[PDB]
């Protein structure tokens with residue numbers, strides 16, 4: 001996170017920490033006791049699929065309290081239409097091997113219904129993005145979970161307000177921009193997979209996933225998040241499906 | 255207006271334009287100076303655009319120059335107060351007043367719904383948790 | 397469909413209607429308005445007209461700068477409108493001289509303080525209630541030679557020659573402004 005602040009312990013209860021071989025990898029979002037939503041690209045270079053760990057109730061990577069819960073990722077479901085090294089369909093559905101315990105420090109973010117999110121949440125100006133990523137573009141990662149309030153823009157406005165960088169990824173209907181173009185606030189690489197939570201009349205809902213952007217908080221650029229509303233039905237059919245033999249699974253999409 | 259011989263009488267704004275309708279010529283004879291005549295003629299000849307009673311549902315029309323302004327009653331809006339604020343109970347309008355989910359219904363009225371872990375209250379628009387840790391809620395603040 | 401264009405703000409005394417083009421041909425419209433940091437509120441749902449009254453929204457805070465956008469239907473196609481700050485841009489309606497009394501060698505011209513669209517405590521605020529000191533009325537009179545006067549209230553106290561008659565006309569004015577600083581001239585009235 002760039003230009004944000006520390007999420008007080010317990011105020012970002014759905015933030016998930018993803019590890020591979022005990023090492024920090026990415027953020028994620030718990031949406032029920034058994035499933036975690038993250039970004040697909042977080043697995044582009046994974047080789048030890050039996051060594052993926054999802055940690056919930058985390059806050060300070062340097063301390064250890066009893067709010068921490070760990071689980072092995074039993075399955076990483078990425079859309080078939082996703083291409084490693086690219087940006088479209090940047091989403092992953094992780095099945096935890098054993099459910100997590102819901103407490104004051106570990107709670108899931110609500111996955112909303114497609115139309116509610118497109119017709120209502122999408123027009124809620126501000127939403128919170130969070131993670132243990134880089135505090136500056138190319139800097140070290142955060143020790144304490146950071147959170148940032150970012151304003152959303154419709155793609156037409158994003159493009160119009162962004163500086164062209166020949167041969168840069170297209171903003172598709174499966175993405176959307178959020179952030180600022182003055183170089184002060186945006187999410188960063190280390191936050192990949194983290195949530196973009198929208199507050200609406202008392203409840204917080206999952207609307208986006210930290211996916212990509214032109215560097216981190218670059219002038220004339222905004223962050224790009226996976227437009228989760230496009231995958232609601234995708235995520236629901238999978239959560240009701242039987243676990244496959246392997247860890248990695250590519251499910252057709254639509 | 256003009257009648258037999260009245261023109262012999264000096265000009266009067268009261269008798270010619272107030273108590274009667276006066277053409278530009280008569281008006282010009284009262285103010286003499288061109289500009290003064292124009293300054294008067296713009297308003298005098300504009301005509302009350304509120305005559306047609308354009309403001310609806312009890313609104314109040316305030317005349318302007320070749321136009322008007324409507325002041326509506328609390329429950330109305332629109333150029334002519336034609337919009338019924340109560341006839342806008344559809345989902346796309348502020349989520350139909352629903353707290354969580356909203357479903358339109360051709361003809362009838364929209365219905366409100368909730369996310370798993372919640373139930374629809376008696377007001378038919380709110381949702382309360384039906385479990386200890388419903389999604390989207392932060393314990394250390396509840 | 398085709399994105400709307402030439403979006404314009406027609407506003408007088410906070411009566412604010414947004415207009416645009418073209419004449420809907422197999423396409424409907426939906427407006428959204430917001431403040432730079434507020435949420436987007438929809439208006440004039442699926443209207444076939446090329447206008448949208450937003451008075452009720454902008455009178456919530458006339459000093460706020462609003463942004464509106466018109467969506468086209470057969471993310472959808474839209475066009476953003478010019479930013480609009482009510483207090484600084486709404487037009488001042490044509491004034492109305494309420495009256496004038498003569499007292500020897502002086503006359504008290506009274507300017508009827510017209511109402512605005514801004515509500516408050518179940519009533520409409522005057523132009524004075526909103527602009528306060530920012531508003532001044534000016535008188536353009538003559539012994540029915542040119543003469544003028546300015547007041548920071550709704551009345552003009554001036555001198556006059558006994559016997560001769562006077563005509564008057566006033567204009568609402570916001571000196572601080574740059575555009576739309578004055579209203580049109582009120583109708584002419586003579587004692």
Ligand SMILES: CCCOc1ccc2[nH]cc(C[C@@H](NS(=O)(=O)CC)C(=O)N[C@@H](CCC(N)=O)C(=O)NCc3ccc(C(=N)N)cc3)c2c1
Pocket residue numbers: 041044084085086087165167168169186187188189190191192210211212213214215216217222223224
């Ligand atoms: C190898 C060919 C690369 O081609 C190009 C050419 C021009 C480009 N402009 C932007 C990108 C896209 C690229 N950005 S970059 O900073 O790495 C490069 C400027 C980019 O963002 N790449 C992805 C991974 C792609 C993968 N699947 O491997 C990535 O790093 N995502 C994480 C992330 C999260 C948040 C932010 C944020 N909230 N700002 C920024 C990054 C890009 C890629």
Ligand SMILES: *[C@@H]1O[C@H](CO)[C@@H](O)[C@H](O)[C@H]1O
Pocket residue numbers: 303304305306307308320321
């Ligand atoms: C009353 O007169 C006005 C003049 O513009 C017109 O717009 C209305 O339609 C009519 O009712």
Ligand SMILES: *[C@@H]1O[C@@H](C)[C@@H](O)[C@@H](O)[C@@H]1O
Pocket residue numbers: 312313314315325326327
């Ligand atoms: C003019 O203003 C409107 C809003 C209503 O109050 C009418 O009764 C009044 O004449």
Ligand SMILES: [Ca+2]
Pocket residue numbers: 058059060061062063064065068
């Ligand atoms: Ca810890």
Ligand SMILES: [Ca+2]
Pocket residue numbers: 255256257260269270274
């Ligand atoms: Ca006559």
Ligand SMILES: [Ca+2]
Pocket residue numbers: 255256257260261270280
């Ligand atoms: Ca005559």
Ligand SMILES: [Ca+2]
Pocket residue numbers: 261264265266280283
């Ligand atoms: Ca005459």
Ligand SMILES: [Ca+2]
Pocket residue numbers: 269273274
């Ligand atoms: Ca007569």
Ligand SMILES: [Ca+2]
Pocket residue numbers: 268273
């Ligand atoms: Ca008379």
Ligand SMILES: [Ca+2]
Pocket residue numbers: 279
């Ligand atoms: Ca003549």
Ligand SMILES: [Ca+2]
Pocket residue numbers: 261279280283
């Ligand atoms: Ca004559």
Ligand SMILES: [Ca+2]
Pocket residue numbers: 300301302303317318319320321
């Ligand atoms: Ca008129």
